[PDB]
Amino acid sequence: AKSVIHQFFESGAKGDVDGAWACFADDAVWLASEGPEPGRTYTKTEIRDLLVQLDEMARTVRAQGMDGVFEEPVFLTDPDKAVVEWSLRKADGEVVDRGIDLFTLRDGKILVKDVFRKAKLAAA
Amino acid sequence: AKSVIHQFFESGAKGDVDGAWACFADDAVWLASEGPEPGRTYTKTEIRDLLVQLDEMARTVRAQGMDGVFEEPVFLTDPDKAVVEWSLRKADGEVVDRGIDLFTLRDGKILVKDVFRKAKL
Ligand SMILES: CCC[C@H]1C(O)=CC(=O)O[C@@H]1CC(=O)/C(C)=C/C[C@H](O)[C@@H](C)C/C(C)=C/CO
Ligand SMILES: CCC[C@H]1C(O)=CC(=O)O[C@@H]1CC(=O)/C(C)=C/C[C@H](O)[C@@H](C)C/C(C)=C/CO
């Protein structure tokens, strides 16, 4: 793959939890979009079940014609960091969920996946 | 300023609402971090009142001893895009709010400010 980031989204789309999990350094953290920190930190031992939960969610939204769309990573002037814009979309194009990941890489592995998403609310 | 993104944040830190607003192109959008879209689209005519609101909230959080930190913008390999990481911290340093802006520029103006934030507890 053209980067570990590409490898990660490849494996996840295919449901290869173990392949996606191995993209992360042993000292990596996945900083989820929601929690008390604010957000929520997952270490490498906890990321695999997160990936399991996400794979469960993925095929149930797919079972309703939803598509998850992950854009090409665009790197920062720091070549070990990149953003990935992403969305979850109904078959008719309606955006259900939209977010951005800030990746920090090290030694060809993911060191940080910092996840953000728009909060769907009645009013901003 | 080092860039129009720098000018926006410096103008805002200086309470210059009109100077910050002027950084946006007339066809710019501010894609807010919450709302039904998901998020919420504000056009250039609506952005000024958002800046007035944020100026007041900044003064309020400061009086409660909180600290807003906006990191140096980092451009992408596409030089018309950049991220700014930001956070809001309690006096001691506890983070109560954390986010990131993805900027799109055109001809020296802000065209898109796409705002994201963590959802708390
Ligand atoms: C269980 C809570 C963890 C989540 C979170 O809140 C923040 C976090 O970072 O990880 C979890 C969310 C997340 O990252 C991603 C990639 C979300 C994309 C999409 O919206 C999901 C519904 C999964 C999906 C169908 C992908 C395409 O098939
Ligand atoms: C109410 C106005 C709309 C907001 C919103 O809900 C979503 C949106 O995208 O823009 C507005 C939110 C916003 O930009 C930021 C950066 C909020 C962080 C923090 O809370 C402020 C107190 C930061 C600050 C000025 C610190 C002073 O040092």
Side-chain angles (χ1 to χ4, degrees):
Chain A
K2 205 254 190 83
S3 77
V4 70
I5 304 185
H6 294 75
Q7 180 59 255
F8 169 80
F9 284 107
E10 281 191 59
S11 293
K14 204 70 154 223
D16 185 8
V17 170
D18 290 332
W21 180 66
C23 293
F24 292 89
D26 278 350
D27 59 328
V29 300
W30 177 317
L31 309 177
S33 67
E34 307 191 284
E37 308 178 13
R40 179 169 155 200
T41 295
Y42 293 83
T43 46
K44 173 106 175 251
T45 62
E46 311 166 324
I47 282 178
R48 198 182 176 281
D49 213 69
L50 180 53
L51 286 165
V52 169
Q53 291 180 306
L54 291 176
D55 179 65
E56 303 291 2
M57 302 196 164
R59 71 169 91 80
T60 40
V61 299
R62 256 273 280 260
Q64 307 156 313
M66 311 225 57
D67 319 282
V69 169
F70 304 94
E71 319 283 322
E72 196 65 346
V74 183
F75 286 79
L76 289 45
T77 59
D78 175 350
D80 291 306
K81 290 177 91 167
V83 297
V84 168
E85 300 178 86
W86 57 260
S87 60
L88 183 72
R89 305 193 73 160
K90 292 176 192 195
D92 62 2
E94 187 199 352
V95 174
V96 166
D97 212 282
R98 184 164 84 78
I100 188 170
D101 296 341
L102 182 59
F103 282 88
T104 304
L105 315 180
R106 193 193 56 211
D107 207 20
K109 295 246 172 93
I110 304 169
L111 186 68
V112 183
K113 184 183 191 253
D114 199 359
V115 181
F116 301 84
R117 81 185 218 151
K118 301 292 192 168
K120 176 71 136 273
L121 305 184
Chain B
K2 287 172 137 188
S3 86
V4 68
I5 302 173
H6 291 79
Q7 184 63 80
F8 169 78
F9 284 104
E10 304 170 9
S11 284
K14 302 190 145 263
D16 178 16
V17 157
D18 295 328
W21 181 66
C23 292
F24 290 88
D26 279 353
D27 56 343
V29 293
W30 178 311
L31 303 180
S33 59
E34 327 88 34
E37 290 180 20
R40 190 187 295 277
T41 300
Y42 292 95
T43 60
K44 169 94 173 269
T45 57
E46 308 170 288
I47 284 177
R48 190 179 187 280
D49 183 52
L50 274 66
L51 297 172
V52 174
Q53 288 182 34
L54 291 164
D55 184 77
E56 307 194 344
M57 297 170 29
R59 298 193 56 261
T60 304
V61 282
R62 219 185 331 278
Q64 300 162 9
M66 290 192 243
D67 198 62
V69 181
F70 297 82
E71 308 289 331
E72 183 75 5
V74 184
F75 288 82
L76 308 193
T77 62
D78 175 353
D80 275 334
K81 302 182 136 233
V83 297
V84 172
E85 295 177 287
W86 51 263
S87 56
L88 181 63
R89 326 217 182 191
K90 265 178 198 303
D92 55 16
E94 184 202 336
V95 175
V96 309
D97 194 12
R98 187 166 75 80
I100 190 172
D101 301 338
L102 177 64
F103 286 82
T104 301
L105 312 182
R106 184 192 62 206
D107 189 35
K109 295 286 217 113
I110 297 163
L111 184 59
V112 182
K113 181 180 188 276
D114 200 2
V115 182
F116 301 87
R117 61 147 50 110
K118 306 288 194 172
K120 295 134 82 183
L121 178 140

